[PDB]
Symmetry: C2
Subunit: 205 residues, 2 copies
């Protein structure tokens, strides 16, 4: 069965950038609910119930048609938030191979940040902004709702291995930022965990 | 040229049910942005800028490819929010006819409420729940993002003339209700404008 993962830090660990009230609600209510809904949907499907969630979401086309959507949404949500929590940490520095890759692919760190900010800002409605690796190269893309690039292009409109991502559902920012998503996106730069992104970049799948 | 309509009441006129902080931000920031972005996109389309917004979103398939998404989203947003403001008011009572296409399609007020709450709660990500008039037949439907049943099935997954509707984008309910959308949905019952809904049940068109 899926379970809500413990966070790697306290709910106030990302202050003063992401707010503690949101962190706590986002984890204990939003994320918990994706877990609960996915488990409920997987009760009747013992062949799928047991796989890591990162695997289940690559196999959505194999599910019964009447289970496709509920698991796309909820196993997607469980996958994405699990990555998100581990992908946030204060005090990290972009450096090494990842940094060199960003500069190579976007020309500069500032162009990369610009391109991610725009992708994050223009995702209309609920969704995610991602840094993804595919074919030796970095790119920035966004997905709808809880879709992940790991689900493939047919389903998500995106593809590749996520290196890092930012939740742009309004629940992730409305308490402190209201409508000002670009402010929330700039604050992300203060808390994106570059050590974990590097580790994913080395691993590459 | 679209004009942001003024609200039919003060920001606090829906208290204690819908919060005044949200009424103000929702109108002066979110609605303002939709108007702006539809207006900007319509500047090169004097052919279409003349139509009422509610007629424009019926014609999305007649726009020039690179215009369809921007106007779907933003003309949809302007249309939906304009209806939303007029469709909110305290102190009204469902009665009279607005009960006359129901129980060949619903069977009681409480049944209809239960169907409406289902659609509102089940809408995954951003969108809207609607009471629509489909020829002869009320029905409950929901749409994604700023889609409207007025855009048709092919585009919105929905159809019918909107009688009334609830905004379930998180911005509409987060500051007061956070993740508790069902508590927000319960409150909508206390502010849904049955007089305006009844009047529309007359706009049949
Ligand atoms: Mn989230
Ligand atoms: Mn809204």
């Amino acid at each position: 069965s899926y379970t809500l993962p413990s966070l790697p830090y306290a709910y106030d660990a990302l202050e003063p950038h992401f707010d503690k009230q949101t962190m706590e609600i986002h984890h204990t209510k939003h994320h918990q609910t994706y877990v609960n809904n996915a488990n409920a949907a997987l009760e009747s499907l013992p062949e799928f119930a047991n796989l890591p969630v990162e695997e289940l979401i690559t196999k959505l086309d194999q599910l019964p048609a009447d289970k496709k959507t509920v698991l796309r949404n909820n196993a997607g949500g469980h996958a994405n938030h699990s990555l998100f929590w581990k992908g946030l940490k204060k005090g990290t520095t972009l450096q090494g191979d990842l940094k060199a890759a960003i500069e190579r692919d976007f020309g500069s760190v500032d162009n990369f940040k610009a391109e991610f900010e725009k992708a994050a800002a223009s995702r209309f409605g609920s969704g995610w902004a991602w840094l993804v690796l595919k074919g030796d190269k970095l790119a920035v893309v966004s997905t709808a709702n809880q879709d992940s690039p790991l689900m493939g292009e047919a389903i998500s409109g995106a593809s590749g291995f996520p290196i890092m991502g930012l939740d742009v559902w309004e629940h992730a920012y409305y308490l402190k930022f209201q409508n000002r998503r670009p402010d929330y996106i700039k604050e992300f730069w203060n808390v994106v965990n570059w050590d974990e992104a590097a580790a994913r970049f080395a691993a590459k799948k």
